[PDB]
Amino acid sequence: MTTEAAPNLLVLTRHGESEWNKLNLFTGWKDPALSETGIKEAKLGGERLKSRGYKFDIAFTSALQRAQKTCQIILEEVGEPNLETIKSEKLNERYYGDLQGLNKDDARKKWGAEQVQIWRRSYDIAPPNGESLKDTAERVLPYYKSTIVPHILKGEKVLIAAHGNSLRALIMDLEGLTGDQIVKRELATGVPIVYHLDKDGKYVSKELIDN
């Protein structure tokens, strides 16, 4: 999509809502089963990505079925499966330690927005065994830098399917955020989101969608 030695374009597609999502319980590393909204969202997303005319050169996903699946759907929907859709384990979601399986209500009712926040967002702190942003980023960036820094420089456009945290960390390092400026950002579930990065891999305008 992007031009050679010009503002590189990176599309990010976050899986819609998973089964456990409807229940309103913490996920973590577990691989839940996407739902109609997610699928419909994926399809819609793909149709949204192909409808506008946004073409893909390369694609990146996580090592989770939700995204590993969500990618196939969107990729199969956009009508460009031939695209190179890679999968990364480092592009997974920040571990939730012993929180995996706790209803947000109970979680928030037992940890409040405060503890829950510092527990879920914070920046570097992570719940009992759970991971954090810096960690995820630190372990997500390698894939990015390593296998995503050579093409992003040539002037190619790429897909990315992981999770709020993953993308958060991504956008974080991709934008050069601050410990107290990345926990305020936000993304869209079901509907992708493209970044206007430069020839180095840094934002140069602002995110955007197709829908």
Please check if 30 is assigned to a binding site.
no
In order of 62, 98, 118, 119, the CA distances from 126 in angstroms are: 20, 11, 8, 6
Residue 150 DSSP one-character state:
T
Q: State the alpha helices, DSSP H only, in the chain.
A: 19-23, 36-52, 65-78, 104-120, 133-148, 151-154, 164-175
* Residue 143 tokens, joined: 């894939």
Domains of the chain plus CATH, in order, are: 1-211 (3.40.50.1240)
d(CA 66, CA 162) in angstroms, rounded, equals 9
Residue 161 near residue 70, CB atoms below 8 Å: yes
Dihedral in degrees, nearest 10, Cα atoms 50, 175, 171, 60: 60
Pairwise CA distance, residues 56 & 42, whole Å:
16
Nearest to 29 by CA among 103, 92, 117, 99: 92
Determine which helix (DSSP H) or strand (DSSP E) holds 85, and give its type and residue range: strand 84-88
Say whether 66 counts as a known binding-site residue: yes
**Dihedrals phi, psi of 113, to nearest 5 degrees:** -50, -40
- Any binding-site annotation on 168? no
Catalytic residues: 15, 93
Angle between helices 133-148 and 164-175 (to 10 degrees): 70
Single-letter amino acid, residue 23:
L
> Is residue 20 a known part of a binding site?
yes
Say whether 130 counts as a known binding-site residue. Answer: no
Q: Are 67 and 97 in contact (CB under 8 A)?
A: no
- Contact assessment for residue 158 and residue 152, using Cβ atoms and an 8 Å cutoff: yes
Using alpha carbons, select from 154, 143, 136 the residue that is nearest to residue 197: 154
Closest CA to 14 of 135, 144, 166, 145: 166
Rounded Cα distance, 100 and 195, in Å: 30
Gap between the Cα atoms of 145 and 136, Å rounded: 14
Token code pair at residue 209: 């969608």
Count of CB atoms situated within 10 Å of the CB of 171: 22
Name the structure determination technique: NMR
Q: Report whether 201 contacts 2 (CB < 8 A).
A: no
Report the alpha-carbon distance of residue 171 to residue 66 in Å, rounded: 20
196 is in an annotated binding site: no
How far apart CA 147 and CA 90 sit, in angstroms, is: 12
Residue 93 gets which letter from DSSP?
A: P
Distance CA 160, CA 170 (A): 10
- CA-to-CA dists, residue 23 to 46, 97, 102, 109, 126, angstroms: 26, 19, 10, 16, 23
Amino acid at 38: G
Parallel, antiparallel, or unpaired: how do β-strands 193-196 and 58-62 relate?
A: unpaired
From the number of C-beta atoms within 10 Å of its C-beta (0-12, 13-18, 19+), residue 35 rates as middle
DSSP string computed for 21-78:
HHHTB--SSS---B-HHHHHHHHHHHHHHHHHT---SEEEEESSHHHHHHHHHHHHHH
Q: List strands edge to edge, sheet with 58-62.
A: 84-88, 58-62, 158-161, 9-12, 193-196
Annotated ligand binding at 185? The verdict is: no
Distance CA 12, CA 15 (A): 10
Residue 14 marked ligand-binding: yes
CA distance 68 to 38: 13
